[PDB]
Structures are given as C-alpha cells and as structure tokens.
Amino acid sequence: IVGGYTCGANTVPYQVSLNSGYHFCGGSLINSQWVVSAAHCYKSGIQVRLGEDNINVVEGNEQFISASKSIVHPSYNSNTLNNDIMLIKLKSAASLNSRVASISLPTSCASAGTQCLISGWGNTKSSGTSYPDVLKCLKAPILSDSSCKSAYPGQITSNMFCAGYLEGGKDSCQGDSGGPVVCSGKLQGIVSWGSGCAQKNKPGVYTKVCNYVSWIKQTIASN
C-alpha cells in the first residue's frame, strides 16, 4: 500500500497473509473454512495466516492453517487477468473471534464513488521498494468505468473496476495482490493489477467480486 496508514492490530480481522515460506499475497476470510484471493496468487504449498499484524513477529493472536485445496476460477485468463479470483479451502476451520472474522460477500455491486478500504503488506513506495511488517490500509474511491477504460484502453473487462487517485500518490501495490477491497461492509474487490503503483493516470485495477458470488456459493457448497 502506497500512501496509506497503519491499520492498527487486528482491526481488519478478515485480512489474511498467504505464506509459502514468506508472505507473497493477501486474501480475505469469507467463512471459517474458506479464503478468497487472486488467481494470479496461485501457488502450491500455501499456509494461510490469520490474525496477523506484524507478519515477522508472533504477537499471540495468529492462526496458521495449511490450505487443503486451491480452486482457480474456471475461466481465469493469466494473460489478460480476466476472472482473477481463486478460492482456498483450509485444512481445519478457523476459530472465529474478535481478531479473526469473516467478511460478507456482496449482494449487489458497489457504487462508483464509494470510499472503500484496501489493505495489505505490499510495497509502500512508488519508485523504490520497502515492504512493511505491519498491516497497512488505504481508503480509496471506486472510479467510473469510463475513466477506468480510458486509463487502460482495450484491457478493462466487465469483471474489473478501477479504484484510487488519478493524480498519483495512493495505491495498492505488489505484495497486496489477492487482498480485500471492502465497501459498505462487503468484499467488493480483490487486488489484481495496475501499471506500476501510485502513478499518475494509472489507477489500481480490482477483480469485481459481485460478478462471482454464484460461483463462490456453488463452489463452497460442493467442496
């Protein structure tokens, strides 16, 4: 997260870290056994880390649970990043408490202009590299479909939205990938892609979760 703030320990209790020996992506807990992340975050041997603030210190509220199964969207296209969404099932149910909680799925898609909360342990610099140990947060508005398509001509599908600040300075970034965009208490986006981070006229692009709620529910009902 570039141009964000320290969230505060466990105030984003649905935020997970995916770990394969190191943090490599975010995710969102949607019930005690299931995490939503980005398909471009797929790898084998994922451990889900719940209840994290400082990802490099055991602070006492963590739950580490290995993935039992990953399910990349059937229509995920790694070339265009269309359908950039994946489900991860946990080997055991998380213990839900004040610091480890699920985030609601949307029933209807989010309004343009809605201020949303994006979070993660990704890079905090535009130009250069610095990865934080504690969870960072950013409040960012959903941009219009027209400004999104103008920013990335030919590349925006109906399964994507832009959020952020056209002037630059505030954005998600590498390492935030797969993490949540929460609007009005619902998981509306997944951190997916963008040209650089926090650059003028190059906002963040997010998976539009509301297009996926039928597939999420049918998948969780069968696995």
- Point out which residues bind Ca ion (CB under 5 A): 52, 54, 59
Q: How far is the CB of 47 from Ca ion (least distance, A)?
A: 13
What residues does 19 pair with on adjacent strands? Answer: 23, 47
Q: How far is the CB of 58 from Ca ion (least distance, A)?
A: 5
Q: How far is the CB of 63 from Ca ion (least distance, A)?
A: 11
Quick check: 12 and 100 in contact, CB under 8 A?
Answer: no
Active site residue 23: no
| Nearest to Ca ion of 54, 155 (CB atom) | 54
Phi-psi region of 168 (alpha: psi -120 to 50; beta: other; left: phi over 0): left
Is 223 marked as a binding-site residue? no
| Nearest to Ca ion of 52, 171 (CB atom) | 52
Is 172 marked as a binding-site residue? yes
Is 33 marked as a binding-site residue? no
Active site residue 40: yes
Is 62 marked as a binding-site residue? yes
Q: How far is the CB of 112 from Ca ion (least distance, A)?
A: 36
Q: For the chain, how big is the Rg over CA atoms in Å?
A: 16
Catalytic residue among 28, 40, 70, 119: 40
Q: How remote is the C-alpha of 124 from its chain's centroid?
A: 16
Catalytic residue among 84, 119, 176, 192: 84
Specify the residue for token string 């208490």.
185
Is 57 marked as a binding-site residue? yes
Query: Which residues neighbour 221 within 8 Å (Cβ) at sequence distance 6 or greater?
Result: none
Catalytic residue among 17, 28, 177, 192: 177
| Nearest to Ca ion of 52, 84 (CB atom) | 52
Q: How far is the CB of 7 from Ca ion (least distance, A)?
A: 14
Is 194 marked as a binding-site residue? no
| Nearest to Ca ion of 56, 218 (CB atom) | 56
| Nearest to Ca ion of 134, 220 (CB atom) | 134
Binding site residue list for substrate: 171-172, 174-175, 177
Binding site residue list: 52, 54, 57, 62, 171-172, 174-175, 177
Catalytic residue positions, numbered: 40, 84, 177
Binding site residue list for Ca(2+): 52, 54, 57, 62
